[PDB]
Amino acid sequence: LNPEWLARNNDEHKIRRNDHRSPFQRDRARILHSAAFRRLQAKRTRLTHSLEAAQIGTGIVAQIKLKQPEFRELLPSDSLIDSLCLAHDIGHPPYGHGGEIALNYMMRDHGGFEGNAQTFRIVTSLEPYTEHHGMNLSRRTLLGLLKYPALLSASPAKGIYDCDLASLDWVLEPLCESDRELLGQRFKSLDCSIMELADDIAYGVHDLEDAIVLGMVTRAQWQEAAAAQLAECGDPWFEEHIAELSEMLFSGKHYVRKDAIGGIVNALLTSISVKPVEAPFHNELLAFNAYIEPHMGNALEVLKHFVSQYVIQIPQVQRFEYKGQQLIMDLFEALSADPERLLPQATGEKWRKAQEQDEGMRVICDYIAAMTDAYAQRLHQQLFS
Amino acid sequence: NPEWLARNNRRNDHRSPFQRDRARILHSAAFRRLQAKLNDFHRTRLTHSLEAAQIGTGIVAQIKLKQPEFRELLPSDSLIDSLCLAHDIGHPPYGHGGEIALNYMMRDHGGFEGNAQTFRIVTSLEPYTEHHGMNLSRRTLLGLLKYPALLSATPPPAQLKAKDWSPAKGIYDCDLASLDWVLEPLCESDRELLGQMRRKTRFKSLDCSIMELADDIAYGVHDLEDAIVLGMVTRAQWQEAAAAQLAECGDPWFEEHIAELSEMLFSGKHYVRKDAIGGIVNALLTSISVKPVEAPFHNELLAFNAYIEPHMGNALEVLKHFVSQYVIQIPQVQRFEYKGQQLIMDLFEALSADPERLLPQATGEKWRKAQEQDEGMRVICDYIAAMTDAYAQRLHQQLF
Numbered sequence: 001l002n003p004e005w006l007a008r009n010n011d012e013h014k015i016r017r018n019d020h021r022s023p024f025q026r027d028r029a030r031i032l033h034s035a036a037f038r039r040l041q042a043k044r045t046r047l048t049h050s051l052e053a054a055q056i057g058t059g060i061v062a063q064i065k066l067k068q069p070e071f072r073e074l075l076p077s078d079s080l081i082d083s084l085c086l087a088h089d090i091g092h093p094p095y096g097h098g099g100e101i102a103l104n105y106m107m108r109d110h111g112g113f114e115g116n117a118q119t120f121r122i123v124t125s126l127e128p129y130t131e132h133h134g135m136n137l138s139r140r141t142l143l144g145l146l147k148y149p150a151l152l153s154a155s156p157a158k159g160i161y162d163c164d165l166a167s168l169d170w171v172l173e174p175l176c177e178s179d180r181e182l183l184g185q186r187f188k189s190l191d192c193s194i195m196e197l198a199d200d201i202a203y204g205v206h207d208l209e210d211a212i213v214l215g216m217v218t219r220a221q222w223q224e225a226a227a228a229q230l231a232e233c234g235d236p237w238f239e240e241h242i243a244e245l246s247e248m249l250f251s252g253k254h255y256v257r258k259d260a261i262g263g264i265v266n267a268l269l270t271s272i273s274v275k276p277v278e279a280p281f282h283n284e285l286l287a288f289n290a291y292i293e294p295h296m297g298n299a300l301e302v303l304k305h306f307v308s309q310y311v312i313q314i315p316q317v318q319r320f321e322y323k324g325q326q327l328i329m330d331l332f333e334a335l336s337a338d339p340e341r342l343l344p345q346a347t348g349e350k351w352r353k354a355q356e357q358d359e360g361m362r363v364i365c366d367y368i369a370a371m372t373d374a375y376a377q378r379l380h381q382q383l384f385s
Numbered sequence: 386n387p388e389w390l391a392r393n394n395r396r397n398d399h400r401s402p403f404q405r406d407r408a409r410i411l412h413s414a415a416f417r418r419l420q421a422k423l424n425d426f427h428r429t430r431l432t433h434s435l436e437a438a439q440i441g442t443g444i445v446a447q448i449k450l451k452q453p454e455f456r457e458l459l460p461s462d463s464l465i466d467s468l469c470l471a472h473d474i475g476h477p478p479y480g481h482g483g484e485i486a487l488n489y490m491m492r493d494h495g496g497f498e499g500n501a502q503t504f505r506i507v508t509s510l511e512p513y514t515e516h517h518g519m520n521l522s523r524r525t526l527l528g529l530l531k532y533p534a535l536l537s538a539t540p541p542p543a544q545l546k547a548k549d550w551s552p553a554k555g556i557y558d559c560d561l562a563s564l565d566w567v568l569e570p571l572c573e574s575d576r577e578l579l580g581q582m583r584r585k586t587r588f589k590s591l592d593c594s595i596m597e598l599a600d601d602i603a604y605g606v607h608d609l610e611d612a613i614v615l616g617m618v619t620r621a622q623w624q625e626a627a628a629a630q631l632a633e634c635g636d637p638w639f640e641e642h643i644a645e646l647s648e649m650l651f652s653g654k655h656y657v658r659k660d661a662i663g664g665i666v667n668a669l670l671t672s673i674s675v676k677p678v679e680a681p682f683h684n685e686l687l688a689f690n691a692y693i694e695p696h697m698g699n700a701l702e703v704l705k706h707f708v709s710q711y712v713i714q715i716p717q718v719q720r721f722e723y724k725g726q727q728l729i730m731d732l733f734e735a736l737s738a739d740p741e742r743l744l745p746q747a748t749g750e751k752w753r754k755a756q757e758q759d760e761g762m763r764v765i766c767d768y769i770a771a772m773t774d775a776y777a778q779r780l781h782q783q784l785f
């Protein structure tokens with residue numbers, strides 16, 4: 001595969017002579033040392049979720065290159081698939097989905113807000129590892145973060161901000177004309193298909209375990225909603241093992257729940273394969289995605305839907321999101337009231353510079369999107385309490 | 386010997402023993418707790434451990450390039466990763482302040498010490514297995530013995546003074562079985578030399594000497610950047626303390642580059658400061674080699690350590706001393722530790738007043754079982770030792 005997929009947007013820095021690491025190992029190190037990644041500890045934290053996703057992602061790849069050796073060379077290296085799972089959630093705003101909706105509404109006339117768009121914007125521009133190119137990651141890694149590789153102009157709509165079109169053009173630059181015109185038509189790269197599967201499996205299964213010990217789900221509710229749906233989900237392993245897994249998850253002993261969680265995770269990984277994308281792509285990274293076997297896919301959706309209605313769709317969480325979304329709107333209206341006097345001094349400078357292109361609002365949105373919940377509340381207390 | 390890959394206790398899992406140790410540590414509750422221990426600063430013990438791990442793998446890469454003789458002996462990436470991810474697992478709430486309190490409250494029951502606690506967590510407390518903690522491979526455990534002696538080998542009397550109750554360093558006597566297991570494939574001559582004192586132990590394995598250097602480099606440099614932007618050190622204090630001492634430290638690179646390094650650190654631009662940090666880190670890494678240990682050790686993991694070049698050692702010691710003088714030994718940090726040590730001592734005295742009634746039920750049950758051996762206090766100590774600051778603050782409020 002083309003060495004253009006290993007390239008960075010800028011070559012000003014020179015790799016040290018003693019440094020024999022791959023471009024993707026350097027990408028992983030950049031993300032791990034970045035302020036955006038460290039913030040995931042505030043946001044079982046988002047950093048914990050991303051570490052689990054990285055381990056599943058490398059487990060998926062290891063499993064695929066055993067069942068399909070022909071693709072051993074095509075598949076992402078361990079440090080690349082790690083990089084996409086450590087970076088995938090850096091763009092989420094304070095207060096999760098409540099934060100996203102507020103920011104999107106406050107930007108309704110200036111490009112909106114969306115978390116995956118924000119991830120792309122952080123790594124290509126906001127993280128100041130370089131002065132002008134963010135973390136300046138290699139092209140293939142950047143392509144792996146484009147879960148929706150079209151512009152938003154084409155709840156927020158998934159896409160890339162128009163203010164980042166230059167860096168999106170750079171990422172897709174080595175693709176032939178027709179591959180680019182299919183991409184905007186729903187479509188994603190192989191590496192990103194793997195990262196997505198790792199993220200869902202981690203969400204479905206690893207949120208579930210401490211939901212049990214915290215008492216947020218009792219055995220009756222697991223049997224009534226998840227365990228019954230899985231006995232009829234159509235995959236033979238789950239229909240066979242569901243009863244035995246339900247007793248391990250409610251064992252009350254960690255060394256038994258761990259065997260259940262490990263068994264569920266492993267069953268999902270072994271049901272993933274590379275199949276051809278069903279469209280006339282020429283580039284191998286868009287012609288193939290990783291897919292989970294459909295029945296095993298049904299079981300994953302039972303786990304995802306179950307964790308969402310008993311961990312997320314409960315009033316204690318939903319009231320916190322309502323608070324968060326009111327709180328974010330308060331900050332946005334105050335800061336845009338007089339940005340130059342209320343923003344931190346450095347952010348005020350970027351706002352002045354950004355106003356020559358009438359992008360002052362995107363700067364305020366960047367600033368809020370990068371706050372933790374503790375930072376936003378304290379800022380809210382400084383402006384209103 | 387393959388005995389170093391053995392544990393105390395799937396078809397498609399073709400990972401090395403050290404890759405499995407890394408995954409266990411990454412998944413452990415003990416590791417996740419390091420995230421807890423108006424700006425946007427989020428440097429934790431967890432981030433400190435990731436940076437140490439990345440320096441550790443870089444150290445191994447430099448040794449395998451300059452000293453091929455040692456390529457079979459040096460630790461794999463995941464083994465050095467595992468030792469840096471775990472090195473800070475045993476630290477109690479409130480850092481040294483917590484440690485002083487627990488040690489004083491355990492004065493008659495084996496004491497408390499963070500490295501001992503780290504050994505105790507991975508060999509027993511973390512409930513990944515029923516009876517052997519994370520059940521790590523023998524060589525990984527050996528890499529964690531920064532002080533491979535018992536606290537019986539390594540009393541103060543008489544408001545509390547920090548100097549009087551800083552713990553000796555070593556392994557708890559109640560974990561002797563798991564220590565005996567780790568040292569089992571050693572000849573008697575290596576074993577009686579390993580517990581030799583300089584009381585302060587003198588020796589450690591090659592894997593652990595590498596982790597110690599990576600930890601020391603991480604502590605020295607990666608605290609330094611945020612100290613500068615938070616205003617905890619001014620340009621003037623950097624010149625008088627660090628820069629002047631580095632101009633006379635004896636290493637030519639630092640004497641040559643200090644002037645330009647100081648202007649880059651105070652540039653005010655992250656993309657410039659990182660190049661100073663990267664160059665300091667790289668200058669330190671590239672100055673490490675494996676040499677023989679000055680003791681007639683027979684086992685190769687004990688006959689060789691990694692050492693930093695001495696003049697380079699002075700530069701590292703200037704940086705470590707500087708972060709201690711302007712980031713740690715400041716009244717703002719020390720009062721937080723005094724408060725924490727008063728807090729830890731309150732929890733211990735209340736909980737030991739009646740453990741069955743006040744402990745959470747699961748910990749109360751462990752306390753009852755442990756009283757058959759009269760080791761109840763260590764159970765209270767493990768419980769307090771595994772709290773975060775926030776959990777301890779909440780428990781304290783429920784009690785006072």
Ligand code: NI
Pocket residue numbers: 049088089199
């Ligand atoms: Ni995610």
Ligand code: NI
Pocket residue numbers: 433472473600604
């Ligand atoms: Ni450390």
